Design a protein around this ligand. Structure first.
Ligand SMILES: Nc1nc2c(ncn2[C@@H]2O[C@H](COP(=O)(O)CP(=O)(O)OP(=O)(O)O)[C@@H](O)[C@H]2O)c(=O)[nH]1
Ligand SMILES: Nc1nc2c(ncn2[C@@H]2O[C@H](COP(=O)(O)CP(=O)(O)OP(=O)(O)O)[C@@H](O)[C@H]2O)c(=O)[nH]1
Ligand SMILES: Nc1nc2c(ncn2[C@@H]2O[C@H](COP(=O)(O)OP(=O)(O)OP(=O)(O)O)[C@@H](O)[C@H]2O)c(=O)[nH]1
Ligand SMILES: Nc1nc2c(ncn2[C@@H]2O[C@H](COP(=O)(O)OP(=O)(O)OP(=O)(O)O)[C@@H](O)[C@H]2O)c(=O)[nH]1
Lengths: 429, 431, 431, 429
């Protein structure tokens, strides 16, 4: 049974984690005390991908919660699933880095990381065949991008074969809540290219765009944006835990998507997203939801896939499907916008199905696009960074900590080589 | 005697045998508990308790596929010492099937064969079942067919491989892990059937009048072909078509062992009454390009040597009469240097019905195995498809980092293009 | 006649005999009270009242082990004047069992043997049971079997010692108390078997399908071998395999008396039905390096003289026919200077089931006793592992302070290395 | 039946002995009056290792209580088990040596120790086969370090074959409650090497470290540290009193641990140690608890075992085990930190199991490591003692009694030869 220890750096990465295990404990039928109350035994036959056992019929999630500031630990302790986690796993410092990167990586985060890897090694020891690590954090912040990349580069030193996932929340140019967001973002990606095996650049703009346009909610009060990123987080590992007609592991997406070892930056997408009570009854019927899935509106990263041709696309399905109706529909998408895919990867749409849907639907299907229009994301940040780095504003809060000044010109050139690398295949053949 | 084991590998390989061994229990009265409430010994080594054990080795490196078989129905039929199971799935990586992980579990699969090949007085041959679509079906089988050819030299070994479809596709590295496996199956294999996966949809669309077929409406049709190929070893008629005096009616040269299967009839239940399914239409249906099992047109190429394998209530009078219309009075041109025609494999046993409700019962059936040169058009849509990807060196770093030398793709493409030149070489006789 | 007494030394000696004599009560219908509700007289000198005293003497210097047998079940079966018991454990010490404390309780043990060796008209031999893991199992047994061969010269004496594993270990001083034992068991012993304890975990995990076997799951698998070795003395067939016959049917020299036991079949109750357990399968399974009862690969070494001891529904037709496969057309190479083959020990009685629920019933068995030269790699550990400890003079002062002279280790290693040179000496014939 | 008279010297040894018999009287089901109220007869068949019989069904523990300080007798005489002990055994002086060593050994202790040997020979006469003497005392103090070593060198004169145990609470540099602690410690060890054949150098720092980190108690109020050293004191002799699958006596331990007659200084360790209400129900599972048992946090001596390779290790299990899972785990531990063991002792981890757990668990397992990192315990004291001996401060309270000044320079060389002897195998092979 392949195993995935699940770290949660940052505050937002802890805000989406309490709605991540809320999905899975419903998906495996697990009470908030930690027992099993599920009906179908096909759930219980493989829960060891995400769980452990107690000295009873009681299961405990393989989670490592890391945040430099408490209170968010007091939220998940007093939430709906407070008695679910292992209380030894709750690693939390004292101060909380105030949106600083040098603090939280060099100064403050180094005093906490050795308390973390004594719990990573404990969870790596109780696993038979470890599959990989997935950590959910927020770029742009202080402790999701300073502690997070320190935690990755210490883990990938010790486990250079296990897969690495990162559900990073990149900053958006419109919905920005931090003046030093273009500093902490462009510092993380230098230490995120070389160590993570496949990330997931979820933006927070398009999640506000889905809940207005597609989902058509009134007020998206953070119990949805930090929930919708969990529905596509269970959608990737829904083939590890359930029997399918054709299933794909985390190694399978990490070998069908990347054509070069630098190009692991994915824009995920989930469908069906109905209205609350309108489109799920009045209009939408659910075969062939790929035309919803490939839409520019129904993305997570705030980039336009019409502005840049795809490289590889993974569409993990979940419902009780029919493999002709999956694949013949998948060919019609590849023949419709035939200029929107790269030439030298023929028949790039990797598919995978399962047999158990999410509870409350009949069919569902995520989508993990490895586009080259993710260069429009990094072209925004490298615009905002190069504006602020001219005046060298906000540098005494980083150079005051143990971080040099040539580190920024080194880290900006590492990003601008990545955008030079992603543009290398948009126009060539 | 005449026993014949069948190893299975891949997500395709176990899923076929989950439904292929569903069929053989119906063709011998074997219960799902393995307890028959004559001569089945080509597929079942029975025990003294009244049980029956199928002679198959279900392997996969990923545990989530065999555990469907190991927990649902038919969980008491098999033997738990033979359902070999790894831990890592060897995800679409030929080097992870041939060098990294498959190297570890070869010595358990190969050990279980000698615990089954020592219960065989007469061993007809091996029946592998894999897909060329990456992973263990191409990576672990290449480490297995290379392995069996050392220990079992003078022994036939069939191969029911699934070819990657031209337009329909599942993997992204489908063209990478198919040039790498034909260097194995060109030498070590013998009469490697290569059915396609798209072409059985175009049989389950018009010939079979169902819509949206799953992989259970498609693996039943691939189980019926392996039934009537081995219907000579366990029934009666005018056969003499055992797997060594049949495969020398197929190959003209040691490199042209790539026939295509074709089954007929596949007529649905509602259309079963509106057609007299007799031997004239039953034979003429096998040569329709909309009725082959591979996405290729045999009207383009030329047949070398078919092998018509009948079964059911036929008589060799009109078999030899309906052949002569197809032999002479048609435009399906044979190659010049063999005018003898093709074999004929008449057997008495009619085919059965899997109770899933796919195709109603008939009285006649064919599995013609034509060694046509229309398989060369099934590789020019792979030689171009692979070289389009290898020109930009995409996805090579997921193989060269796993224990595979980078020059092997420049060897496998060099080999399989010389095969296509060789396959088109025997297409002409006179200047 | 044909009586055979079994003495038991150590914590391993009684815990085997707690489950060894559990098996003989099922193999003769004897109740736990000793009151049978033919010929059991090889193991049970019965009394006139209807009871049956088992002819065994349990020796341990520590009372905490025999008091389990003296108070639980089978507490009325044994004779209370024969469960000899000291006060100090003297454990993990050769000299404290051979010089200090074991010198005191020898005169109660050896007197109790002559109160049982004077009820035997025909005394076949003694069956000791100990471990080489220190304490009384090597210290007291070296004192006992030196004392027995003075009073009983022309009498065989078997030895079912538990040789210590290379990796799985319990005592820290475990290599010291085995080099000091082989100086005794080279001279005084006869056909000293040496099973291991790690090799049963590689049997009770794959061949027998249970997880985490206790010491009550290896002391039943060691009980069946002493059953089927002495199954010739008390049953029928085509045997002639009494303990004086197979003794010099096995050893080629007075120094090569170290065979290995091997049992087959050991298949669990779940896969007891999915495999026909016939005599060709039973012998071919009995030669696997993954099925021996010691941590050694017999494919590395060469067999000198095997000794198969079948029992149950076999016939000497296909026993002698299945042997010739293993005799000639295999690569398990015999030594050159004896081409006669090996003994065949066919018995009539099938093996029974201990009701603890470990292995289901069968119809055939074999306890092959190969005198291979692959035991020279079992002593290749302890010739090095003890020499690695003695180079730094570790733990010597717990022996030189007890009565053992410090030059004894320099004598025992010098003897045991010359034995290993002697074992590898008879492996070659031609220049 | 092997017998062990148990001598609670000092006051801290009397403080941990009042919680030592509270374990055993629960472990055999003995009421505080002294009767038997136990259920299973397998715990009654051998109680004579630690007990006697009166003229009824009423047992009296084989205990000798020695303290120059009085009044702490009246704690255990008026505690929960005041009516359990034999009142003739209560030996106590009048003054109470005030953290002096020369007083308490030469002057004060010699006027009391002849009353003790008229009781330890009274208890040696009612024993059939004596195994050894346990004595629990506090090193660095006044009574247990000066009366204790006078008591050992008088006992080992009369019984040179019986084994000896010493559960000496050593001083620690961080938690020190005595200014003359590095004087009474280094005077005791010279008279502790030559006479006892296995000690158990527990510490009071790591006991404070366990109740905050591992056990996570709020206030370690001395009813826990005196209890936690009582669990690993019953755990050594839990094979003498219970029928095990593979049992080990005290003679079996001292023949498996010391490779040379001077290397008897063992750092014990006990596991499982849960939280107070969390891990004992939810998180912790109890197969393969050796991962807890080998950690640096779960030790008794405040020393880092990673700073020095182990010589020999005894792990006495208690629960209903499974001897493959005991030994396969034991090989995986020895192969993991394969540099942390001595080369010339191969396969050193001694196992020993039993059949009866402590009342309130299912499995439990002590651990008795004979490390070489115990030289760090003696390099602190021989640093502090050599600092004070330069100025020769606090010396008239020892030279005032019948103790010479050259005794300290002799006792330091006898300690520094031991640290030279323990360092002799950390680097050699
Ligand atoms: N997906 C979600 N993102 C959020 C949410 N709330 C805030 N944020 C996002 O995450 C960012 C918050 O920054 P962080 O989580 O990294 C807080 P930081 O680690 O920098 O310091 P601390 O406050 O001490 O934890 C914010 O800019 C938003 O981009 C949320 O509820 N859900
Ligand atoms: N393990 C424990 N040690 C204690 C405890 N209380 C005190 N002490 C330890 O014991 C030391 C003091 O106890 P002592 O018996 O040595 C005092 P002394 O020998 O002079 O006897 P009295 O004056 O009669 O008390 C102190 O430095 C601590 O290291 C305790 O509750 N547990
Ligand atoms: N014809 C047919 N092909 C199938 C069927 N199921 C799966 N396949 C093919 O099998 C391939 C799946 O991979 P496998 O052959 O099992 O090898 P793999 O990559 O190791 O897959 P896993 O063992 O699951 O990791 C896909 O390319 C499919 O085209 C089926 O039911 N019928
Ligand atoms: N195979 C097997 N070996 C055992 C069993 N019980 C104990 N042993 C072996 O016994 C060895 C230890 O020696 P002991 O049997 O205890 O000999 P001893 O020291 O004289 O016995 P005591 O003095 O009572 O401690 C260990 O290495 C174990 O391998 C058992 O049930 N089965």
């Amino acid at each position: 049974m392949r195993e995935i220890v699940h770290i949660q750096a940052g505050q937002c990465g802890n805000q989406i984690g309490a709605k991540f295990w809320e999905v899975i404990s419903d998906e495996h039928g697990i009470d908030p005390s930690g027992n099993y109350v599920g009906d179908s035994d096909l759930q219980l036959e493989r829960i060891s991908v995400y769980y452990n056992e107690a000295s009873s019929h009681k299961y405990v999630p393989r989670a490592i919660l890391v945040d430099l500031e408490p209170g968010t630990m007091d939220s998940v302790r007093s939430g709906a699933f407070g008695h679910l986690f292992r209380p030894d796993n709750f690693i939390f410092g004292q101060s909380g880095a105030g949106n600083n990167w040098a603090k939280g990586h060099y100064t403050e985060g180094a005093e906490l990381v050795d308390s973390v890897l004594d719990v990573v090694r404990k969870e790596c020891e109780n696993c038979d065949c470890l599959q990989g690590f997935q950590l959910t954090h927020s770029l742009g912040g202080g402790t999701g991008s300073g502690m997070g990349t320190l935690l990755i580069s210490k883990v990938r030193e010790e486990y250079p074969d296990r897969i690495m996932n990162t559900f990073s929340v990149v900053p958006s140019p419109k919905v920005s809540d931090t003046v030093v967001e273009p500093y902490n973002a462009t510092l993380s990606i230098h230490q995120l290219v070389e160590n993570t095996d496949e990330t997931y650049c979820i933006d927070n703009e398009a999640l506000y765009d889905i809940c207005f346009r597609t989902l058509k909610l009134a007020t998206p009060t953070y119990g949805d944006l930090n929930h919708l990123v969990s529905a596509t987080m269970s959608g990737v590992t829904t083939s590890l835990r359930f029997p399918g007609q054709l299933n794909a592991d985390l190694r399978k997406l990490a070998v069908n998507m990347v054509p070069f070892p630098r190009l692991h930056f994915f824009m995920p997408g989930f469908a069906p997203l109905t209205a609350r009570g309108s489109q799920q009854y009045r209009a939408l019927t659910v075969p062939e939801l790929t035309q919803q899935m490939f839409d520019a509106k129904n993305m997570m990263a705030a980039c336009d896939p019409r502005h840049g041709r795809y490289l590889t696309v993974a569409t993990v399905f979940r419902g009780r499907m029919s493999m002709k109706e999956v694949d013949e529909q998948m060919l019609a998408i590849q023949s419709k916008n035939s200029s929107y895919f790269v030439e030298w990867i023929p028949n790039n749409v990797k598919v995978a199905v399962c047999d158990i849907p999410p509870r409350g639907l009949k069919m569902s299907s995520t989508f993990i696009g490895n586009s080259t229009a993710i260069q429009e994301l990094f072209k925004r940040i490298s615009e905002q960074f190069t504006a602020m780095f001219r005046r060298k504003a906000f540098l005494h809060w980083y150079t005051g900590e143990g971080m040099d000044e040539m580190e920024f010109t080194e880290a900006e050139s590492n990003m601008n080589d990545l955008v030079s690398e992603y543009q290398q295949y948009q126009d060539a053949t | 005697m005449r026993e014949c084991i069948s190893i299975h590998v891949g997500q395709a390989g176990v899923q076929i045998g989950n439904a292929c061994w569903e069929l053989y229990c119906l063709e011998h009265g074997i219960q799902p508990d393995g307890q028959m409430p004559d001569s089945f010994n080509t597929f079942f080594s029975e025990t003294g308790a009244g049980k029956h054990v199928p002679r198959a080795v279900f392997v996969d490196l990923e545990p989530t596929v065999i555990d469907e078989v190991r927990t649902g129905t038919y969980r008491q039929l098999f033997h738990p010492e033979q359902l070999i199971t790894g831990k890592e799935d060897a995800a679409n990586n030929y080097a992870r099937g041939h060098y990294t992980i498959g190297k570890e579990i070869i010595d358990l699969v190969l050990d279980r064969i000698r615990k089954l090949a020592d219960q065989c007085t007469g061993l007809q041959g091996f029946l592998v079942f894999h897909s060329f679509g990456g992973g263990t079906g191409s990576g672990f089988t290449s480490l297995l067919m290379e392995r069996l050819s050392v220990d079992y030299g003078k022994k036939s070994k069939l191969e029911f491989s699934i070819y990657p479809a031209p337009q329909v596709s599942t993997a992204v590295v489908e063209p990478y892990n198919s040039i790498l496996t034909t260097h194995t199956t060109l030498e070590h294999s013998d009469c490697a059937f290569m059915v396609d996966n798209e072409a059985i949809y175009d049989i389950c669309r018009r010939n079979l009048d169902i819509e949206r077929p799953t992989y259970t409406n498609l693996n039943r049709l691939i189980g019926q072909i392996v039934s009537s190929i081995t219907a000579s070893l366990r029934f009666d008629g005018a056969l003499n078509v055992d797997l060594t005096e049949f495969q020398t009616n197929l190959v003209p040269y040691p490199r042209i062992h790539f026939p295509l299967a074709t089954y007929a009839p596949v007529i649905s239940a509602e259309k079963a009454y509106h057609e007299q399914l007799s031997v004239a239409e039953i034979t003429n249906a096998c040569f329709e390009p909309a009725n082959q099992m591979v996405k290729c047109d045999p009207r383009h190429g030329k047949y070398m040597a078919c092998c018509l394998l009948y079964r059911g209530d036929v008589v060799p009078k009109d078999v030899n009469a309906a052949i002569a219309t197809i032999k002479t009075k048609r435009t399906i041109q044979f190659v010049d240097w063999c005018p003898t025609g093709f074999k004929v494999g008449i057997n008495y046993q009619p085919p059965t019905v899997v109770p899933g409700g796919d195709l109603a019962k008939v009285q006649r059936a064919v599995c013609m195995l034509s060694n046509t040169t229309a398989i060369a058009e099934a590789w020019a849509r792979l030689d171009h498809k692979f070289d389009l990807m290898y020109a930009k060196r995409a996805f090579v770093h997921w193989y060269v980092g796993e224990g595979m030398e980078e020059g092997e793709f420049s060897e496998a493409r060099e080999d399989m293009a010389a095969l296509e030149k060789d396959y088109e070489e025997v297409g002409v006789d006179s200047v």
